[PDB]
Amino acid sequence: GYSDRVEQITLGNSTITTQEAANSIVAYGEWPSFLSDVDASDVNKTTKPDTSACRFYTLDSKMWTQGSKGWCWKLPDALKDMGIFGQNMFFHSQGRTGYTIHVQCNATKFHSGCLLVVVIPEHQLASAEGGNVSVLYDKTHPGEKGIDLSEADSTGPMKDPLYMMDGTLIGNSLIFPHQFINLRTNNTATIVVPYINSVPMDSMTRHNNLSLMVIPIVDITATSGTTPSIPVTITIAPMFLELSGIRSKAVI
Amino acid sequence: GYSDRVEQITLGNSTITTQEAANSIVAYGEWPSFLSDVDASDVNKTTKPDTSACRFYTLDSKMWTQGSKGWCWKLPDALKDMGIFGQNMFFHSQGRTGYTIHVQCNATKFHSGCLLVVVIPEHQLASAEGGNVSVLYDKTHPGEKGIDLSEADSTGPMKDPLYMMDGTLIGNSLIFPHQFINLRTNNTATIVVPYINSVPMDSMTRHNNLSLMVIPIVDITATSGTTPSIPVTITIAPMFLELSGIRSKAVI
Amino acid sequence: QTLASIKSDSKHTQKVPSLTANETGATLPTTPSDSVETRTTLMHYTGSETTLENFLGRAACVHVVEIVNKRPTDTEEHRMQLLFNNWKINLSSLVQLRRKLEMFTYVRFDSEYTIIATSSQPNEAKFSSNLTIQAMFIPPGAPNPKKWDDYTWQSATNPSVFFNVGKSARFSVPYLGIASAYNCFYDGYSHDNSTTPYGINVLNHMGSMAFRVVNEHDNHTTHVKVRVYHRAKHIRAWVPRAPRALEYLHIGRTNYKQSPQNPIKTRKTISTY
Amino acid sequence: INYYKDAASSSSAGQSFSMDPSKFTEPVKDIMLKGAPALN
Amino acid sequence: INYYKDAASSSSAGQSFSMDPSKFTEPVKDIMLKGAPALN
What we know:
The PDB classes it as virus. The entry is titled "Cryo-EM structure of rhinovirus-B5". Chains A, B: Rhinovirus B5 VP2. Organism of A, B: Human rhinovirus B5. EC number of A, B: 3.4.22.29,3.6.1.15,3.4.22.28,2.7.7.48. The structure is cut from a larger assembly and holds two copies of chain A (252 residues), one copy of chain C (273 residues) and two copies of chain D (40 residues). Chain A has helices at 83-91, 137-140, and strands at 7-11, 14-18, 25-26, 57-65, 71-75, 92-96, 99-104, 111-121, 147-148, 178-182, 188-193, 210-222, 229-238, 242-246. Chain A has 252 residues and is mainly beta. Chain A has one domain: Jelly Rolls (Sandwich), CATH 2.60.120.20. In chain A, the strands form four sheets. Chain A has a five-stranded mixed beta sheet, with no helix packed on it. Chain A has a five-stranded antiparallel beta sheet with strand order 9-5-12-8-10, with no helix packed on it. The longest helix of chain A has 9 residues, at 83-91. Chain C contains two helices and eleven strands. Chain C has helices at 52-56, 95-102, and strands spanning 3-5, 41-42, 60-69, 84-88, 104-120, 132-138, 160-164, 168-173, 182-183, 208-213, 222-240. The radius of gyration of chain C is 26 Å and the shape is elongated. Chain C is mainly beta. Chain C has one domain (1-273): Jelly Rolls. The two termini of chain C are 38 Å apart. Chain D has one domain (1-40). Chain D is 10% helix and 0% strand. Chain D is built from one helix and no strands. Chain D has one helix at 22-25. The chains are: A mainly beta (252), C mainly beta (273), D little secondary structure (40). Chains B and C meet through α2 and β10 of B and β9 and β11 of C.
């Protein structure tokens, strides 16, 4: 038979295999899909890169140690340098895509701690300076580097994870598609997110759609030994990538 | 009604319009098309970029003046820097495509002269040094620059157009798909070429398939005035681009 | 049978088959009946002689090697002294064949080989000897003999042929690919590197054929020349191309002399008959 | 009449084909020798 | 086509067989690649 905790995800020319997973989430109960002929307003025949873009990409892993505040990535920005997907973002006026997001964090039975993985649409960030100060492009578009909430930045966004960089308490963030990685059981989270917007297609560069946050709700710890350090690896793939409006590569 | 000399070619998001053209050529009587399931040996699902790559790209124009020997471009090499098509060449192990090639050369009724446009498959070049000297990668892969047969190069290929850089007389090159631009009538040539190879798909970087040559069989001249100088513009598009074997961008 | 020409009488019309535009690249078919009045007449011809199969289907000498019966010398490899002589297969060696093949870009066929050996004794030999000659096919990656009597000659898996001097061997070799057709030309490299060799030599991996005089050393040296002939069968070819005009220099290359002789003969004037 | 099983061992039969010069003489899209102007 | 009576004198015919790798690749009692755990 089969167990919910064991799963294989095949996408394009890449696969992910898990043995200790929680049932994956399909955000808002809907699968990613292509734009229909009654949603579209764009008269340009769209491009569907399929496999060439819709595959898993892995973002540079970050270390989870005691005292870590958590991390944040923006989509599609995080994948801007990821091969074809990356290039397509700059050669097209607009695009549309859902994502599959996998957060991986290995541990033994002597470890404890818990990450909260949340995907927040339109996560408009608060500036570190407060007041009426906006956040600069450069600080909302770190790409793969993501935003390390543990790192001070007087010109960056607010970092204190109690509020998810927006004045809203983390406790209620579970309203958003989310999944936990409780080292006690699962060692990975999987979230599938459909394209979400008020506009059928949109810029891939002036605007992010999703904000992926991973927060150590319960600090990592071992039953014995020194402060543990466990890498957290994030793997993300476009689901149904649809592009439009080919033009000279954007320069930013 | 319609005249053969007037034609519109629409491809992807680009168009070409001609008023003084010769009927286009479909090399060997066959249209470009996708690899069938009985030709393929590649188990990898292929990628079909369609519009994103299959559009017209224009190569930097060259001047045709008296004394010019002609020019040569290699495909796909010539398009290696051409946006998406270009990038796809380096991200895939192998690929397959036909081309539409347009050679444009404007003149008035006071001009005369004639270009021969020939597409030669597997045009293995003779070294300028003769002997047993091979031609270096760098000199067979000029990209957009092409090979100017008017320019001396002791390490390049043979340049004298009498022989089409291979010891074979130009007079008999008309055996290959070809078209003339006789300034007297047409001012453009159009050739459509199917993928031609012994192998279903092949490297897009270690090997060229087609060699496009444009040779001033009859020197450009005017009825009066100084030596004329007419630009020759070449516009090329992939027809049915099919790609396989995604991997880290090739570096050469 | 079919007609070569169809009776046609004087015309006065608007249709003019005699005018066209070669700029189109077309070579639209016309007949004598389009230019002149003609009598009706039959072809009495099938074109059988001109079939690709008959053209490339005649045997041609491909390569000649020399091997000898001689007492091995301690100071020389058995290749330096011709006790054994490994031909790298390439039909481009003897250029008449080469041209016939180069007329096409891609060529597919099964091969038939005929191997003929002839001995000679330029020395003071007191008698002739009908030496047994062994040919061994060595596919790429297969062991290359080091000695005239090496273990490799066991031919456990390598195809091999034994025949006597004065006799001949004949055998067929199926199309060896690896592609769907043999390439006569290759506008490319083995890989993406500035210094990589350019041209068909990149693809020519048909292996080699080793020749040996099987017989042990006699009391004199005997010289044997072995001529290899090739004939193509079940021949298909694609993308015809113009035949080479200039003299060939080296195998697998399209190189020519830096200052070649123009193939075209000249005359005093364009008006000279 | 065949004595061997490999196809390669067969004789160079033997089947003629009709000619198709149009691949090389009339690759031009949508034309015909109607006596009509080639370019119009 | 046969010229001799001893079986040994016959040619090396000539009858192909289907493959059966399961003897060497799947000798394991009662299993199948169902995507199911190998040991459970």
